[PDB]
Design a protein around this ligand. Structure first.
Ligand SMILES: Nc1ncnc2c1ncn2[C@@H]1O[C@H](CSCC[C@H](N)C(=O)O)[C@@H](O)[C@H]1O
Ligand SMILES: Nc1ncnc2c1ncn2[C@@H]1O[C@H](CSCC[C@H](N)C(=O)O)[C@@H](O)[C@H]1O
Lengths: 122, 375, 227, 375, 227, 122
RNA sequence: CCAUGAGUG
RNA sequence: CCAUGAGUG
RNA sequence: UGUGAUGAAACACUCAUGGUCUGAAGACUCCC
RNA sequence: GGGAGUCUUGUGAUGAAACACUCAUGGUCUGAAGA
C-alpha cells in the first residue's frame, strides 16, 4: 500500500492496539477517519494510527501529510476491523487517534519513540 | 560519525565537536544550485554531497532532512537525521564567515550579492510551478460564472423596471429573463410586435396573442426611439452574457472532468469547482474532513453557532445539489451529511491521483438518499 | 516640518506643517516606496513614512516597545513576509550591513514580494511553509531576531520550532499573537496569556508583552529572549 | 341658500336640511364621466353642474371643492366651499340608493357594475400619465449606468486575477482597467504582443518596451488556447461595457438637459440624475430642504447619528462633486452646505417650471467656494 | 384536513395534514391567487390561505382582535392599498354585496393592484393621495369600516381627515400604527400612546389595542369607533 | 408674482407681522426657507409666513403645495425685508413659521380665520 | 462572520 | 440604517 | 451671510491567510 | 410487558440557522453668526 510510509513489526503493531484500548478506558480517543483529521488539524492528537487495508486507499492518504505539518507522529496497524474492535466498535475503522493516553502514557511513549528509530531519528 | 550539512555554499562534513572534517564547494553557478535546491525538496542528494561521501568514507552519516535519509541508504551508507542538531547550528553560526573560508566567494560583499540573486531565482522558479496548477483555472472560471450569474440577474432586474415605463404588461407575462431580453432586443416600441417574429421564438400561439393583446391594450407610455434604443443596449448585453455563461459552463466542464473527475462525477463541474474555490485548491479540499465540506460556504452561519453554542448550518454551498434544496426541510440535514462524506472521499481519490470511481460513489449516495426518503 | 532621531536606532518622528507626529525610517532606496507612503526630505535626506496602522512593528513602538532588537546591521529571520510592507521598513533599519530572510508560503502575495526584494539586497525572498524549516534551511544562516507574523493556529509552536533552528542564543524573538486567528471563540486576553506560557515553558525570557490596539484589534506582540 | 354636490352620479343640489333641491343626472357613459372626473381636479365643473346652476337660480351656492370656487364665480355666482359638510355626508349615506332615485341606473345591481369599470378606467388613465413622466427615464437610465459601473469594476478585478495565472507582471503594469482588458482582448498569449497594437492604444514608446520585456521574462504559466479564450470572453465583455456607458452617458445628458436644465448646470448630468434617483422624482427633489439634499445617499451614517446622538455625515452622493472630494475635510462641509443650497434653488426652478437660470447660480456657487478656500 | 368557521364571518381555520392551524377566507375568484397563497378545497368549496406574516389583518386576528367590523357585505374604505394582499382578503370577506374602496398613490404598486382589482368586482381601485380625499370624493360612498394602513408620519391625521368624510357615525376605524415610519428615534410604545390620544380627541372610542409583533415589528393596530 | 393664490389687504398683512413679533418674545418661531420647509414637514408650524416679493419666484413655490399636504395654513406679506426684520434679524427672509404663538394665540387664531374667509370657507 | 496583509470604482 | 408591501438568482 | 453662517462619520467592491458543526446510532422482524 | 434474532452504519448513524440580489413607502444633520 502506498499511503504507508514506513514499516510496522507486529510487536509494534500490537502495543498500539492495546494502547488504544487503555485510552478508551483511562483517557480520551477519537475514532473514525473524519474525526482523526479534525483531531490533527486541532493538534489534540498525540498519536495517530492508520489501518493498512483501506479501500480505496486515498481515503486515509491525507493523514501522513497532515501529521507532519502539525508534527504529530503516525503509526500503522494491519487490519481496519481490528482497529475498530479495539475502538469499542463492532465495525471497522480506517484510522484512529489518541488525544489522551491516560493509563497508557508509558505505553504510548514507548511506541511514539520506537517509530522514530525506524524513521532514522537521533 | 559524520554530521552532514547542505547549503548553497556547497556540501560540508563535521565531526561531533563541530570542527570542519572535509568540504566540496559548489560551483558559483545559479543554474545548478536552483535545480538542486528543488531536487533536495524531494530527497535527492546534492551532487556535491555525493562526492563528499566518497572522499571521507563514513560509518555513520546524519542529515538535516529526514527525506534525504533513504536516498543515501539506497546509495549504501547507514543514515539517520537529527532535525535541529548542534552541528547544523554550528555550521550556520559560522556562515557569515565559512562562506569565505571554503572559497565560494572572495568576501562578504558578494556572497550576499549571490545568495540574494539565488533567492530571487530560486523563488522565481517556485512561483512558476504554483501558477502551473490546473485547478486554478477551474477556480477562476467558476468564479467568473458566478460573476456573470450575478450580473445577469442585476441587468435583468434593471431592464424590466426600465422597459416597463413603455410596456409594463410584458414583465409579469414573461417569467424567464432571457426570453424577456430578446423581446426588448428585436422589437423596441410595443407597436411593432408581430405574430411571425414571435412564432419564431417558439411561443405557443396562445401566449403570442396574450402578448399582442397586452401590447395593444398597454397603459404604458408612448416613448421615443432614442429612449428605447438606450434600453436595448442593456437587453443585448443580457443576451451576450447568457451566451458567454453557456460557454464558460462548457469550458469549466472540460477542466473539471480533467482535474477532479469524482467530485465532478458527484456534484457536477459548477458546484464542484465552487468547492475548489472555497477550499482554495484541490489539495486543500482533499485534506478536509466532511464536517467542513458540509458547511463550506456558511461561514456567517457557522461561526455564529460556534461562538454561541447555537444551532449549526445543515449545509453550505452544498445547498445547490438537487437532492438537497428540493427535499423537504427535515431531509436536507442527512442528505447533506451523506454527500459531504462522499465528497470528501471523492476529493481525496481525485487529488491523490486516483482514477475515476464516480459510478459507485453516486450509487452508494443514491442508496443513502433512497433510505432517507422512506420515512 | 522638522525631523529628528528617536530613542531607537534608525527610527524617527516628524514635526509637520500642522503640528502632527508620524514615525519614519531612513529610505534605503530613495525615490521608491513599496506601499503608498509619504516620502519626505529633511536636510536633503529621504525618509519613508511608516504607517503604524499597517505595520505591526511601528504599532508596538508607538504602543511602547521599551527596547528594539532590530537595528543597524542586524541579521533577521522574518516568518510571513507577505507583500513586504513591514519587511521593507526593517530593510531601512538594518541597512545593508545586516540581512533579512523572508519566508512566505503564499505565492499570490510573494508575487509582489519579489518586487520589494529586487530593489533591496537586504531582503531574501523564500517561498516556503514555516512549518518545515527544513525546506529553507540550505539558504539562510542564524539570526539575532526572529520576527514572526504568520497566520496559524500553532503560530507560536511553529515559531518555537524555527527558533531551535535559527535563533542565536540570547537573540530576541518578536512573536506576534493573532487571537482571532488562533481561535475566534476564545477571549483574546485569555489567549495571549495561554501562548506566552508556551514561550516561557520553552524557556524564552519574556521581556515585554505589547497590546496593539487600536493599531491592530485582537492583536498582541511578545518580545522574549532565547536561551 | 343652496348646497351643491359633484359626483359620477351627476350634480345634485341640497338645502341645508339634506333634501335634494334639484338634480341633473350624468350620462351613464364611461368615456365622458372619466374626463369630467379629471377636470373637477383642476376646478372645472361638470357640465351637469352648470345646467343645474341654471334650473334653480340660487343666491348663495356652496360646493365640495375649493378649486371650483374661482371657476363658478367667473360664471357669475357667489361661491364658497365647506369641505366635509353635513350635506356632502347626507349625500353619500344615501349612495346605495340615490343612484336609482335620480335615475342614473335602474337598480343597485349594475350601478356598481359600472362604478367598478369607471374605477378601473379612471385610474388606468392616471397610471399612464404617471409612466409618461419625463424624469422616470432620467432615473432608470442612470441607475442602469451605475449598475454597469459596478459590473465593469468587478469583471476587471476578476480578469486581472485570472489572466495573471498566465502573465502576472502585466497586472501591475497597467493602471487602467480598460487598457488592460484591451491588451488581453487583442493578443491572448503573452507572446503575441506586437509594437503596432501597442502604439495603437496610445501607449508611449517607453512603456512599450517595459511591457514587451515583461512578457518575455515572465514567470507565468503556459496555457492552452481554450484557457485563453475563456479569459478573453470576460475581457471582451469589459470593453463592450465601456462603450455602452458612453452611449447611456449621452442619452442621460440630453434627458438631464431636457427635464432638469438648472440642476444639470450645477453638478453635471449623472449626479443630477443620481439625486433624481434617490429623491424618486424631480418634483420630490424640489420640495426638499437643502439640509436633506446635502446628505442624500448617506442614510447609514445619518440614521446612525440620529439614533445615537453622535456625529452626522458632511455629504452623501453630493460627495462626488469634484470640488468636494479634492478638497480637505474642513472645506467639504462648507462646500456641501453651499452646494445643496444652490441645488434646492436649481431644483425648484426646474420643477415649478421656471426657465433656465443656471449661470448666475454657478457664479454664486463658485464665489462662495472661493470665499471658503481663502482661509 | 378539516375546514371550519371561526368566530368571525367568512373567516376560516384549517386542521391540516400535520396539525398546524392556518387562517383562510372563502375564495371569491376560484382557481386564482393574488400572491403565492395555497388554495385549499374542502367538501368541494375553495378557500384562500391567509398568511398573517404578510397581512396585518390576519395578525391582529391571530393576536386576539375582539370583534371584526369586516363581515359579509361590509362597505370599507381602505387607505394604502398597495399590492392588494390584504385588500384581496377583505374582498373575500365582504363577498360581492359588500364594497371596498382601495386608495394607493404609488403607481409602481397600483400596477399590480390593477390585476387584483380586475377579477374582483368587490374592489374599486384608486390611484390617489389619501391626504386629499377631494380627489376620490367623486367615486366613493360612505363606509362602515375605515382600514388605514399607510406609511406616513401624519398617518393618523390622514386617517382622521378621511373619517369625517367617509366614516359613518358608530362606524369603525382599523388604524395600523407603523412606528418606525412615524419616527425612528422614539420608542414604538411611546408612539402608540400619542396616536390613540389623537383618536380619542376626535371623538373616537378606542375599543382595542393590539401589537402585531412578531408578525410585524414595531407595529400596532387600533380598532376604534367614530362618534 | 404667481405663487400667491390670494390677495392680502394691508390691514391683514400688518396684523400678520405683529403676530410674528409677539411670537419671538412669548412663543417659538423659525426663520428661513429651508427651516420653514422642515417646520411644515414636521407639523410644527401653526402658521407659515411666505413673502410676495421674493426673487426668483420658484424658491418658495413648494411651500403652498406642502402646506396643503400637511393642512398647515399659509399667509403672505408684501415686503421681504420687513418679514426678516420682524423676525429679529436685520436681513430679509423669504418664508418663516410660527411654532408656538405665545401671546399671538388670539392674534393668530384671528388671522388664520380671516385668511379662511378670503379663501371661501364655511 | 471575525482578525490580518495587498488592492479597485 | 430601521420598519412595511411586491419579487428575482 | 436665513436666496443658509458655524459644527460635523459619503457610498459601491476585489484578492490573500488563519479561525471550518456533532460523533453511535437509525429501520425492521420472530417467540409467550 | 418479558425474551429473541435481522438489515444499514466511523469508507459516518443521530441532532442541526446555505447564500447572492431588485423594486415601492415612510423615518432624511445643525440654524446666526462669519473674515
Ligand atoms: N504557514 C505559513 N508559513 C509562512 N507564512 C504564512 C503561513 N501562514 C500564513 N502566512 C502568511 O503570514 C502573513 C501574515 S500578514 C503579516 C505580514 C508581515 N508581518 C507584514 O507586516 O508585512 C499572511 O500574508 C500569510 O500569507
Ligand atoms: N399619502 C399616501 N396616500 C396613499 N398611499 C400612501 C400614502 N403614503 C404612503 N402610502 C402607501 O401605503 C403603503 C403601505 S404598504 C401597505 C400594505 C398593504 N396595505 C397590505 O396590508 O396589504 C405603501 O405602498 C405606500 O405606497
Amino acid at each position: 500500500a502506498s499511503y504507508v510510509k514506513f514499516e510496522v513489526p507486529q510487536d509494534l503493531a500490537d502495543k498500539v492496539l492495546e494502547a488504544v484500548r487503555k485510552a478508551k478506558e483511562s483517557g480520551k480517543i477519537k475514532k473514525g477517519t473524519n474525526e482523526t483529521t479534525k483531531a490533527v488539524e486541532r493538534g489534540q492528537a498525540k498519536l495517530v494510527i492508520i489501518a493498512e487495508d483501506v479501500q480505496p486507499e486515498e481515503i486515509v492518504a491525507h493523514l501522513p501529510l497532515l501529521c507532519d505539518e502539525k508534527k504529530i507522529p503516525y503509526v500503522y496497524v494491519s487490519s481496519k476491523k481490528a482497529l475498530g474492535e479495539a475502538c469499542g466498535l463492532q465495525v471497522a475503522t480506517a484510522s484512529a487517534a489518541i488525544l489522551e493516553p491516560g493509563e497508557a502514557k508509558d505505553l504510548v511513549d514507548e511506541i511514539i519513540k520506537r517509530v522514530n528509530e525506524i524513521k532514522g531519528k537521533t | 560519525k559524520i554530521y552532514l550539512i547542505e547549503h548553497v555554499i556547497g556540501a560540508v562534513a563535521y565531526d561531533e565537536n563541530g570542527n570542519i572534517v572535509d568540504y566540496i564547494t559548489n560551483p558559483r553557478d545559479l543554474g545548478k544550485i536552483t535545480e538542486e535546491l528543488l531536487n533536495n525538496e524531494k530527497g535527492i542528494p546534492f551532487s556535491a554531497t555525493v562526492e563528499l561521501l566518497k572522499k571521507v568514507n563514513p560509518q555513520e552519516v546524519v542529515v538535516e532532512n529526514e527525506a534525504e535519509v533513504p536516498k543515501l541508504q539506497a546509495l549504501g551508507y547507514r543514515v539517520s537525521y537529527e532535525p535541529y542538531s548542534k552541528v547544523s547550528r554550528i555550521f550556520r553560526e559560522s556562515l557569515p564567515k565559512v562562506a569565505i573560508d571554503i572559497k565560494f566567494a572572495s568576501n562578504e560583499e558578494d556572497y550576499y550579492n549571490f545568495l540574494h540573486e539565488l533567492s530571487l531565482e530560486y523563488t522565481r522558479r517556485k512561483l512558476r510551478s504554483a501558477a502551473q496548477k490546473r485547478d486554478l483555472l477551474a477556480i477562476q472560471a467558476v468564479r467568473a460564472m458566478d460573476d456573470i450569474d450575478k450580473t445577469i440577474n442585476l441587468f435583468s432586474e434593471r431592464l424590466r423596471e426600465w422597459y416597463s415605463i413603455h410596456f409594463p404588461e410584458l414583465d409579469k407575462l414573461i417569467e424567464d429573463h432571457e426570453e424577456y431580453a430578446t423581446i426588448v432586443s428585436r422589437f423596441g416600441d410595443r407597436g411593432f410586435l408581430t405574430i411571425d417574429s414571435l412564432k419564431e421564438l417558439g411561443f405557443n400561439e396562445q401566449r403570442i396573442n396574450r402578448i399582442l393583446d397586452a401590447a395593444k391594450k398597454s397603459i404604458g407610455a408612448d416613448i421615443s426611439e432614442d429612449d428605447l434604443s438606450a434600453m436595448r443596449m442593456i437587453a443585448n448585453t443580457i443576451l451576450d452574457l447568457y451566451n458567454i455563461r453557456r460557454n464558460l459552463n462548457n469550458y469549466l466542464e472540460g477542466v473539471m472532468k480533467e482535474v477532479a473527475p469524482n467530485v465532478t462525477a458527484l456534484v457536477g463541474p459548477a458546484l464542484g469547482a465552487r468547492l475548489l474555490s472555497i477550499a482554495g485548491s484541490l489539495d486543500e479540499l482533499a485534506k478536509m474532513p466532511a464536517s467542513t465540506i458540509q458547511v463550506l460556504g456558511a461561514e456567517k452561519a457557522l461561526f455564529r453557532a460556534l461562538r454561541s453554542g447555537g444551532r449549526p448550518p445543515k449545509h453550505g454551498i452544498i445547498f445547490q445539489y438537487p437532492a438537497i434544496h428540493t427535499s423537504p426541510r427535515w431531509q436536507r440535514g442527512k442528505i447533506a451529511r451523506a454527500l459531504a462524506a462522499k465528497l470528501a472521499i471523492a476529493a481525496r481519490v481525485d487529488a491523490f491521483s486516483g482514477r475515476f470511481i464516480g459510478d459507485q460513489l453516486n450509487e452508494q449516495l443514491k442508496k443513502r438518499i433512497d433510505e432517507i426518503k422512506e420515512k | 516640518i522638522t525631523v529628528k532621531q528617536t530613542n531607537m536606532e534608525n527610527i524617527y518622528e516628524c514635526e509637520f506643517n500642522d503640528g502632527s507626529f508620524r514615525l519614519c525610517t531612513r529610505n534605503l532606496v530613495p525615490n521608491f516606496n513599496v506601499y503608498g507612503e509619504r516620502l519626505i526630505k529633511y536636510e536633503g535626506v529621504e525618509y519613508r513614512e511608516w504607517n503604524a496602522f499597517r505595520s505591526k512593528l511601528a504599532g508596538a513602538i508607538l504602543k511602547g516597545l521599551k527596547t528594539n532588537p532590530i537595528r543597524k546591521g542586524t541579521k533577521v529571520l522574518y516568518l510571513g513576509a507577505a507583500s513586504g510592507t513591514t519587511i521593507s521598513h526593517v530593510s531601512d533599519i538594518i541597512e545593508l550591513n545586516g540581512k533579512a530572510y523572508g519566508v512566505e508560503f503564499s505565492p499570490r502575495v510573494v508575487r509582489e514580494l519579489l518586487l520589494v526584494a529586487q530593489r533591496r539586497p537586504n531582503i531574501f525572498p523564500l517561498l516556503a511553509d514555516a512549518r518545515f524549516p527544513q525546506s529553507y534551511k540550505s539558504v539562510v544562516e542564524n539570526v539575532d531576531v526572529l520576527y514572526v507574523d504568520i497566520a496559524q493556529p500553532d503560530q507560536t509552536d511553529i515559531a518555537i520550532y524555527n527558533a531551535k533552528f535559527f535563533l542565536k542564543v540570547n537573540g530576541d524573538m518578536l512573536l506576534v499573537i493573532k487571537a482571532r486567528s488562533i481561535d475566534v471563540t476564545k477571549d483574546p486576553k485569555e489567549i495571549y496569556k495561554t501562548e506566552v506560557e508556551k514561550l516561557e515553558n520553552s524557556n524564552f525570557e519574556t521581556i515585554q508583552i505589547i497590546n496593539l490596539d487600536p493599531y491592530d484589534k485582537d492583536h498582541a506582540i511578545v518580545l522574549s529572549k532565547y536561551k
